[PDB]
Amino acid sequence: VSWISWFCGLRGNEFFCEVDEDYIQDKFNLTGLNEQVPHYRQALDMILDLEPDEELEDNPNQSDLIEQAAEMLYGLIHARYILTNRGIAQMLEKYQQGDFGYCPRVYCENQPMLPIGLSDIPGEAMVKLYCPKCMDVYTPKSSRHHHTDGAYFGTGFPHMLFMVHPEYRPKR
Amino acid sequence: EVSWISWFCGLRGNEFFCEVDEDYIQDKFNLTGLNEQVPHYRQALDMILDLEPNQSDLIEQAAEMLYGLIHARYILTNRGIAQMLEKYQQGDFGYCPRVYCENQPMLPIGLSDIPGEAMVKLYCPKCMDVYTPKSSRHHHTDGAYFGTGFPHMLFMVHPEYRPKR
Ligand SMILES: [Zn+2]
Ligand SMILES: [Zn+2]
């Protein structure tokens, strides 16, 4: 399985959706990201499953540092991706599956929530959950999601989704 | 040798309960009215107080219901409230999930005082709303064992713990 499929499958990455390879392959979609993550070249290669460099001698491995970079880069791409009609389509799918959890308010009656970020700057805050019914923001019940940066989901995702799919917005 | 009460409050899922003072239970005046709500009231009250005892499990079930009803009244008394306030300070009931409530500890609360109506819920004193416990281990604890007015009783007796919202 692809790096992306492998990543989105890990424990804690349930909120993520699989970004279409072609979206990533189009340089125009990643403009600006390459200057936010270290080892951008090797990291983007790892995400797309390509020959992982030469790698010769004592040359300290710095391997893990690249794995982390791929992780950050995938996140930033994810953020942009889920604003596009295709990404939104995929998230809407998970939404229908309750992939993001249900609102804990007793009166929201288990309204499924959408992931959301309190900030678009990486390292600011971890991902939170937005209930479209009571329109408030909650902390995920599972600690497994307490290390997922919210910037990988953005502050305007939930808004975008309902803008494109008004029919799913809770009534009254 | 652990007392029935100590044993009960120690079971998985009964973390929201506090241990009712034996003497409170021994005073007949405090239980007036309860004896006509649970079956086998005599044997059940005996089991709760650790006294000389197929219909067995049915009595264990009765002691469980009876302890709950007593708990409900108990936590309205200054002594019960004191104990609950303790657990409250330990975050024994959990913290509010609202991101902006900033992990405000919550108090248990019932949506109804009638047994069998609804399971126990959590009241955040900051956003003043009611939530369902994150852990499924608490999804079988009747809310009637905590009452609809407990949280409000606690803060009337301890206004100083009223969060600045
Ligand atoms: Zn809600
Ligand atoms: Zn709250």
Residue of chain A with shortest Cα separation from B133? A104
Residues by chain with Cβ below 5 Å of ion ligand 2: B 96, 98, 101, 124, 126-127
Identify how the structure was determined.
Answer: X-ray
Among B13, B23, B83, B18, which residue's Cα sits nearest to residue B49?
A: B23
Resolution at which this structure was determined, Å: 2.9
CB-based contact B105:B91 (threshold 8 Å)? yes
Q: Is A134 annotated as a binding residue?
A: yes
Fold of A102-172: N-terminal domain of TfIIb (2.20.25)
φ, ψ for residue B35, nearest 5 deg? -55, -15
Residue B77: both structure tokens together = 């008394």
Beta-carbon contacts of A91 under 8 Å, excluding residues fewer than 6 positions away, are A17, A82, A114, A157, A161
Domain residue extents for chain A = 1-101, 102-172
The Cα–Cα gap between A94 and A16 comes to 9
Among B60, B22, B56, which residue's Cα sits nearest to residue B38?
A: B60
Residues by chain with Cβ below 5 Å of ion ligand 1: A 103, 105, 108, 131, 133-134
The Cα–Cα gap between B117 and B102 comes to 31
φ, ψ for residue B33, nearest 5 deg? 105, -30
Domain A1-101 has CATH 1.20.58.340: no
- Give residue numbers after which chain A breaks (C–N above 2.5 Å): none
- 3-state DSSP of A86-107: HHHHHHHHHHHCCCCCECCEHH
Fold of B95-154: N-terminal domain of TfIIb (2.20.25)
Residue the block writes with tokens 């126990």? B120
Q: Which residues on B lie below 8 Å from A106 (Cβ)?
A: 111, 121, 129-132
Q: Is A131 annotated as a binding residue?
A: yes
- Tell me if residue A152 falls in helix, strand or coil: helix
Q: Is B8 exposed, middle or buried (0-12, 13-18, 19+ CB in 10 A)?
A: buried
Instruction: Please list the helix, strand and coil fractions of chain A in percent, rounded to the nearest 5, in that order.
Output: 45, 10, 45
User: Strand A128-130 relative to strand A114-116: parallel, antiparallel, unpaired?
Assistant: antiparallel
Q: Choose the CATH number for B2-94 among 3.30.420.10, 1.10.3720.10, 1.10.1820.10, 1.10.10.60.
A: 1.10.1820.10
* Dihedral over Cα of B36, B42, B44, B47: its sign: positive
Instruction: Flag if A128 and B99 touch (Cβ within 8 Å).
Output: yes
Ordered strands of the A114-116 beta sheet? A114-116, A128-130, A137-138
Residue of chain A with shortest Cα separation from B120? A106
Give the H or E element holding residue B80: helix B78-89
| C-alpha triplet A54, A58, A61: angle, nearest 5° | 60
CB-based contact A128:A116 (threshold 8 Å)? yes
Helix (DSSP H) and strand (DSSP E) numbers for chain B:
6, 3
- 3-state DSSP of A33-78: HHHCCCCHHHHHHHHCCCCCCCCCCCCCCCHHHHHHHHHHHHHHHH
